[PDB]
From Swiss-Prot:
The keyword Secreted belongs to this UniProt entry's keyword annotation: yes
Gene Ontology cellular component annotations, sorted alphabetically: extracellular region
Native source organism of the sequence: Staphylococcus aureus
Function: Responsible for the symptoms of toxic shock syndrome.
Gene name as annotated: tst
Main subcellular location: secreted
Name of the protein described by the UniProt record: Toxic shock syndrome toxin-1
Highest taxon in the source lineage: Bacteria
């Protein structure tokens, strides 16, 4: 059996994510943005971190690789609104999609990847990287599904030796999230399930 925190994490990381490309900024206030997606929908996205306060102005184009915080709403004006958190980046692409270096260990033993995708975007928010890594761990490596796979961490090491890491036994800390990173500058990504 697992505890309720682990159950919340399983529900959170096994639901998918929302992807929108070339959306347009309608408004940008403190802690949030109102964006119009190319399909007509509107996205209201919150940004709780002072370290990651998107500065895009009205009219600029952006990409969304985010998670919904609640069910979308059909409004009176007839507008479809999404409620999401974080995951807004510029629209720049890499010359060719790259394969991020992810090494996973379960109980000290190496665990081979399955369906780990390629990425063609120059920058990705750390929260996006967090849900992509954890999704792979939950779907393929059993993270959060049983009591013997409830913790560990993932660590991203950049070329300059700087690091980013997240504790798998807790939800990603959105309130202190750092700015998006250039994924081609990532040297290694390691994930260990205790």
């Amino acid at each position: 059996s697992t505890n309720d925190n682990i159950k919340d994490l399983l529900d959170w990381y096994s639901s998918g994510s929302d992807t929108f490309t070339n959306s347009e900024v309608l408004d940008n206030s403190l802690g949030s943005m109102r964006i119009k997606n190319t399909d007509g929908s509107i996205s209201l996205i919150i940004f709780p971190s002072p370290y990651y306060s998107p500065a895009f102005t009205k009219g600029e184009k952006v990409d969304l690789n985010t998670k919904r915080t609640k069910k979308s709403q059909h409004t009176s004006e007839g507008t479809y609104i999404h409620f999401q958190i974080s995951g807004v980046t510029n629209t720049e692409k890499l010359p060719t999609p790259i394969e991020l270096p992810l090494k996973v260990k379960v109980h000290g033993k190496d665990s081979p990847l399955k369906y780990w995708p390629k990425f063609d975007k120059k920058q990705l928010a750390i929260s996006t990287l967090d849900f992509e890594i954890r999704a792979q761990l939950t779907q393929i490596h059993g993270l959060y599904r049983s009591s013997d796979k409830t913790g560990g961490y993932w660590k991203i090491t950049m070329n300059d030796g700087s690091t980013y890491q997240s504790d798998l036994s807790k939800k990603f800390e959105y309130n202190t999230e750092k700015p998006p990173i250039n994924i081609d500058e990532i040297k290694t990504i390691e994930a260990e399930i205790n």
